[PDB]
Amino acid sequence: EGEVTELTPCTISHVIIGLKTAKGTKQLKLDPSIFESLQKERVEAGDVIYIEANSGAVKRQGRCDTYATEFDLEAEEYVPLPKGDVHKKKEIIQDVTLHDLDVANARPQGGQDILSMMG
Amino acid sequence: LAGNAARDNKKTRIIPRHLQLAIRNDEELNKLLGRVTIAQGGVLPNIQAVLLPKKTESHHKA
Amino acid sequence: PFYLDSLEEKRKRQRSERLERIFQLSEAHGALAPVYGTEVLDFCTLP
Amino acid sequence: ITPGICFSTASLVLRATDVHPLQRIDMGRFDLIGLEGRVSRYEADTFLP
Amino acid sequence: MTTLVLDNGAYNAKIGYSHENVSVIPNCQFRSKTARLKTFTANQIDEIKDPSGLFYILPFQKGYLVNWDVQRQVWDYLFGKEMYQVDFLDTNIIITEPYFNFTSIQESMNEILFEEYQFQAVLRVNAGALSAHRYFRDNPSELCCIIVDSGYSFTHIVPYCRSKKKKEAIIRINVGGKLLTNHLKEIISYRQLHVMDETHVINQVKEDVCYVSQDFYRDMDIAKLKGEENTVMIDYVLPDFSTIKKGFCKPREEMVLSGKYKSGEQILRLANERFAVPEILFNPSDIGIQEMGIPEAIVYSIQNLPEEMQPHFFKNIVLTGGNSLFPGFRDRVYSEVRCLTPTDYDVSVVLPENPITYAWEGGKLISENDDFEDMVVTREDYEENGHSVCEEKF
Amino acid sequence: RVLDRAARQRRINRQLEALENDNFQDDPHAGLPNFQALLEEQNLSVAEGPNYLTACAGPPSRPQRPFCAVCGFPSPYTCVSCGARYCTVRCLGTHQETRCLKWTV
Numbered sequence: 184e185g186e187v188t189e190l191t192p193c194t195i196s197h198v199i200i201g202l203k204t205a206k207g208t209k210q211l212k213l214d215p216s217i218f219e220s221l222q223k224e225r226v227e228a229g230d231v232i233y234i235e236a237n238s239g240a241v242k243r244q245g246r247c248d249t250y251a252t253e254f255d256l257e258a259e260e261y262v263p264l265p266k267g268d269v270h271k272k273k274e275i276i277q278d279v280t281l282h283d284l285d286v287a288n289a290r291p292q293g294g295q296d297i298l299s300m301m302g
Numbered sequence: 303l304a305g306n307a308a309r310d311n312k313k314t315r316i317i318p319r320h321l322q323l324a325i326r327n328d329e330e331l332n333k334l335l336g337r338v339t340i341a342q343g344g345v346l347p348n349i350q351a352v353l354l355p356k357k358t359e360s361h362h363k364a
Numbered sequence: 365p366f367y368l369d370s371l372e373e374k375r376k377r378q379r380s381e382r383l384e385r386i387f388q389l390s391e392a393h394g395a396l397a398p399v400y401g402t403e404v405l406d407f408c409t410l411p
Numbered sequence: 412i413t414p415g416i417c418f419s420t421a422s423l424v425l426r427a428t429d430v431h432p433l434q435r436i437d438m439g440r441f442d443l444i445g446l447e448g449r450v451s452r453y454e455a456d457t458f459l460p
Numbered sequence: 461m462t463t464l465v466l467d468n469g470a471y472n473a474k475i476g477y478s479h480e481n482v483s484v485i486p487n488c489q490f491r492s493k494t495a496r497l498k499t500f501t502a503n504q505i506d507e508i509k510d511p512s513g514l515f516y517i518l519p520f521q522k523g524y525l526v527n528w529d530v531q532r533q534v535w536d537y538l539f540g541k542e543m544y545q546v547d548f549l550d551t552n553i554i555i556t557e558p559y560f561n562f563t564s565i566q567e568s569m570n571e572i573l574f575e576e577y578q579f580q581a582v583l584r585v586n587a588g589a590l591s592a593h594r595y596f597r598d599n600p601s602e603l604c605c606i607i608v609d610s611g612y613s614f615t616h617i618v619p620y621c622r623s624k625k626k627k628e629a630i631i632r633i634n635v636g637g638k639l640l641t642n643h644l645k646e647i648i649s650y651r652q653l654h655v656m657d658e659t660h661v662i663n664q665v666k667e668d669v670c671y672v673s674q675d676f677y678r679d680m681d682i683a684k685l686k687g688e689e690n691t692v693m694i695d696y697v698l699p700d701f702s703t704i705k706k707g708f709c710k711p712r713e714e715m716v717l718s719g720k721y722k723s724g725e726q727i728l729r730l731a732n733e734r735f736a737v738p739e740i741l742f743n744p745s746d747i748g749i750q751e752m753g754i755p756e757a758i759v760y761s762i763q764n765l766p767e768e769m770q771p772h773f774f775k776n777i778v779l780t781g782g783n784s785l786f787p788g789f790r791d792r793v794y795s796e797v798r799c800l801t802p803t804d805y806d807v808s809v810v811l812p813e814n815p816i817t818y819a820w821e822g823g824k825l826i827s828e829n830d831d832f833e834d835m836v837v838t839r840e841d842y843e844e845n846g847h848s849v850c851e852e853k854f
Numbered sequence: 855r856v857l858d859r860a861a862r863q864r865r866i867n868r869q870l871e872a873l874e875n876d877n878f879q880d881d882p883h884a885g886l887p888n889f890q891a892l893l894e895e896q897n898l899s900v901a902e903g904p905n906y907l908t909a910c911a912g913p914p915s916r917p918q919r920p921f922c923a924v925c926g927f928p929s930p931y932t933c934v935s936c937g938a939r940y941c942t943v944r945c946l947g948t949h950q951e952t953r954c955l956k957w958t959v
């Protein structure tokens with residue numbers, strides 16, 4: 184987590200993303216397969232975003248706080264800058280039910296052609 | 303209107319001041335009494351608060 | 365001549381963590397086997 | 412053509428009820444339907460092991 | 461040995477013998493209607509019983525010497541007749557200079573700067589180099605450092621490696637003590653108690669109550685309402701010089717929120733300048749100067765090509781200069797540079813105990829340790845080598 | 855009417871210049887009764903490479919704060935006359951009566 188500072192897509196071999204937080208900045212090689220999602224979120228230098236190391240669940244929280252008022256009127260969220268360590272590794276011991284798993288495996292996912300009808 | 307002006311000025315007895323203020327504040331009464339002048343009356347005043355945040359006495363020999 | 369032993373140690377440790385992470389994620393994504401796969405359906409899938 | 416489009420309203424607290432990245436478990440390790448059209452029987456039975 | 465060390469900052473000439481003469485002497489002249497014709501020298505201002513309405517004949521224009529007359533008289537006074545003596549070998553005067561110079565400012569020295577006070581190793585070296593030398597002396601294990609010389613005219617960001625000025629990556633954002641003082645003057649004047657005449661006592665408000673806010677928007681939201689803890693209503697008494705000769709913020713117990721002080725003093729201060737003015741260093745371009753802040757520049761120093769040198773640079777940030785001592789300045793700079801710097805790199809900020817005389821202490825250490833037989837440029841060499849030897853050594 | 859953009863830029867430049875006028879900001883009389891030149895000494899032959907010309911920081915990345923020109927508080931508004939921002943209607947009035955197309959500060 185952190186304010187994305189720069190995207191440098193290296194047929195993409197990989198895309199480096201710099202995430203800024205109150206405790207510093209870090210550069211990550213970001214599995215160009217999820218550059219699709221990166222573009223889907225329209226994220227670019229300045230935004231605060233999440234990304235999950237397991238699947239690439241990039242989530243745009245909005246623009247940074249310091250970039251507010253760049254346009255005295257603009258429909259934005261301007262989420263505060265994260266204060267913790269950009270590298271957020273923490274264990275989740277939460278439990279799930281077996282019927283929840285069954286339901287999650289009952290119907291497919293995706294809108295390949297008309298399968299969007301599942302939403 | 304004169305009583306309203308007097309209560310706004312914190313007075314009980316209506317005076318030419320209040321009559322002038324009421325006549326010149328209302329849109330239609332002023333149109334009706336534009337030519338009229340009132341004794342011991344006055345024109346609408348301006349506020350002096352504008353002097354404070356522009357210039358005042360400095361610390362020089364204060 | 366500029367060198368920082370602590371920085372090299374931190375970089376090596378984070379690189380080891382990185383390799384362990386990628387190995388874990390690669391092993392965790394291919395542990396599930398399909399119920400039918402793809403050749404089974406293509407076989408049963410008539411025109 | 413009525414311009415009186417029905418216009419519901421509610422706080423965003425009612426929409427962020429299901430978002431907590433560092434508190435949700437990864438269900439990708441248990442899904443089976445997604446593997447039907449992506450993964451092959453041979454890929455899992457012979458090659459990967 | 462009667463050696464000497466000299467700093468000629470635009471705000472104040474920090475000079476004196478190497479025997480701990482750090483005494484801080486203003487580097488300009490003064491005139492006032494209470495002083496119709498007497499043009500008081502550097503420290504003669506103390507003779508003025510009423511320094512109200514002083515006019516500053518200063519030889520500096522945006523940090524560069526100009527008209528050469530105020531400095532001439534100040535030197536003839538300090539080092540010529542009274543406080544210090546002139547001698548061809550005793551006073552080992554070392555001089556400070558801006559980080560950029562030209563043949564005319566201090567290189568051409570025919571009977572000027574080479575006048576009767578000479579010695580073997582005349583040094584006209586930037587104050588940044590002296591500060592870096594002192595730092596490395598009190599920090600021997602360090603290889604490089606970034607000096608933040610928050611002076612009157614500039615706040616220079618200059619890297620060093622124990623001798624070497626990294627000229628390729630130095631920045632001097634136009635914001636300085638002069639701009640801060642003048643902006644405070646105008647802000648006070650065009651809101652209440654028009655006293656923008658003097659770079660004087662309002663300069664005291666610039667030092668007595670000014671502080672850098674840790675959270676600017678938070679202190680602002682606390683200031684937008686009357687009677688809160690932030691004490692935006694500083695209620696700074698203006699000195700009339702008939703009852704008091706220096707202003708000061710009234711204690712919190714004597715606050716009159718209605719401003720109707722029965723003492724007769726003009727106290728109607730409610731605005732946020734007291735912490736909005738110090739904030740100009742960190743986020744400029746809010747007043748209009750399209751420049752970067754000092755943390756933004758400390759980080760833009762990433763332009764230093766060698767990567768292995770950046771983690772050594774980031775650990776030796778020195779916040780010297782007179783303006784660096786605002787309450788809350790060092791920690792604010794640290795917070796701003798820590799988030800911008802990589803998470804894996806270490807950041808260590810240091811603020812000298814006396815960031816104004818730090819350069820003078822560095823000059824003292826230079827004198828009393830070495831630089832008498834080497835790195836020398838004498839008038840005898842200038843007479844034989846002219847401008848060449850001076851620019852060669854510096 | 856409305857003022858142009860040249861006037862606003864000239865106002866900004868002149869205010870920044872006044873912010874460095876040290877002798878006397880408004881009225882440098884205070885009594886009239888080796889003489890090197892001004893900053894022109896080098897400002898007339900500005901060199902290249904590392905120097906006070908290239909030593910400038912440049913434009914910042916953080917957007918400008920919308921702060922009021924009257925009281926110094928946040929200003930989500932902007933006056934049409936000279937662009938000077940203001941916080942409330944009271945601020946706009948105090949501005950128009952002190953700064954407008956006719957007056958600068």
Ligand SMILES: Nc1ncnc2c1ncn2[C@@H]1O[C@H](COP(=O)(O)OP(=O)(O)OP(=O)(O)O)[C@@H](O)[C@H]1O
Nearest residue numbers: 469470471472523611612613614637667781782783
């Ligand atoms: N106690 C204090 N609180 C706040 N500010 C202070 C204090 N003491 C000094 N200052 C500020 O420090 C400044 C002095 O800076 P200094 O003289 O070190 O710069 P300089 O060496 O002249 O720089 P240059 O050589 O570029 O002109 C003054 O403008 C003053 O406003």
